Structure 1
Amino acid sequence: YFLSAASRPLCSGGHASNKEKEMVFCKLGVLVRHRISLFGNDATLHILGQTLDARTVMKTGLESVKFLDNAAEDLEKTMENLKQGQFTTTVALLPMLSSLFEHIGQHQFLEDVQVSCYRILTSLYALGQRSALGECLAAFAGAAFLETHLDKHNIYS
């Protein structure tokens, strides 16, 4: 109905809180929260800034391992932002810089965060910043390892 979106800012507070509980089966709450993010996306107005700040507190509050339960479903979570980005600016576009910061913060680990950054580069290139996308290129080159470096030119503009 309509009450799921009215509690989605109450779920945006929950998606940031239950992923900050993934800092220490351990991080499965963030794997449930990434499953909760696709749960509202695969079925379908400041929730664009409310969900992006929920992931901005998820990238900071769970930045101890970037155990490993949130990064695995990132190909499903970034496609959930692909199905919900086109489904609907210093508070919303500023958290988009924190979206690539999680991809530039999980490139110092698997390579599934690079495939999620290109999956976030699909919704970023069709949405119509150089510091985070520029650091993701040269620090993820030779240590498809250049998938996130391909997401730099596909999300800078």
Structure 2
Amino acid sequence: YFLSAASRPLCSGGHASNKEKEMVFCKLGVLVRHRISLFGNDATLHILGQTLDARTVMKTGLESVKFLDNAAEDLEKTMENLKQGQFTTTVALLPMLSSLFEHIGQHQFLEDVQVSCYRILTSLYALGTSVERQRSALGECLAAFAGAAFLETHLDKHNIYS
């Protein structure tokens, strides 16, 4: 019932423990976190946005290693955040300033960081089915993708222009 939504709030603190597990064997545990969140996105209001703010702290620890199989499975976790955006205040736009500035550091990397933005392009497709400086910082990811396999993050730059 509503205890399962409180179990999602308690699992966001368990995802904050997975942020400590992503600091260090635990890379296959992030691949299990993607398949379990994909079924939890098929399973699905301010505590759920705070669980996405606790997932923004989990995205801050995941931006440090952007191994490569965990970042490729993070695309399956970002496609789960797209279906979690297909399930439906100013702290969620602060999470967009941490994920767009980490895309400029992701320009040094390899295809798994572009796969995480290709599935986050479906999160922009699901937010359209449902703060402007983060889209201008997402327009910096357009110069990071189209300057140099190059069409994967370029299609994500078309959904980042919205």
Return the TM-score normalized by structure 1.
Answer: 0.79
Whole-angstrom distance in 2 between the partners of 1:143 and 1:55: 31
Cα displacement (A) at 1:133: 0.7
CA spacing shift, 1:79–1:66, aligned 2, 3 Å: closer
- String of CA shifts for 1:17-68, please: whole Å, max 9, x gaps: 2123212224233333333322311333124422332332123224432233
Task: Specify whether residues 126 and 143 from structure 1 end up closer, same or farther in structure 2 by C-alpha distance, changes over 3 A only.
Answer: same
1:4 to partner: Cα distance: 1.7
In structure 2, do the counterparts of structure 1 residues 11 and 97 end up closer, same or farther at CA, with 3 Å as the change threshold? same
Say what the alpha-carbon RMSD is for the aligned residues. Answer: 2.6
Residues 8-17 or 101-110, more deviating? 101-110
Residue-pair matches, total: 157
Q: Which residue of 2 aligns with 1:58?
A: 58
Work out the percentage of aligned pairs sharing the same amino acid.
Answer: 100
Shift of 1:104: 4.4
CA gap of 1:52–1:106, structure 2 versus 1, over 3 A, is: farther
Runs of 4+ in 1 over 6 A off after TM superposition: none
Is the CA contact 2:31–2:73 (under 8 Å) kept in the aligned structure 1?
yes
Question: Displacement, 1:125?
Answer: 3.5
Number of the residue aligned with 1:133: 138
- Given that 1:34 and 1:70 are in contact with CA atoms closer than 8 Å, whether structure 2 keeps it comes out as no
Asked whether the 8 Å contact 1:118–1:147 carries over to 2, the reply is: yes
Distance 1:154 1:133 in 2: 10
Cα 1:64/1:87, change in 2 over 3 Å: closer
Q: Deviation of residue 87 (structure 1)?
A: 0.8
CA distance in 2, matches of 1:55, 1:22: 13
Range that drifts further, 32-41 or 103-112 = 103-112
**What secondary structure is seen at the aligned counterpart in 1 of 2:118?**
helix
Structure 1 residues not aligned, in runs of 5+: none
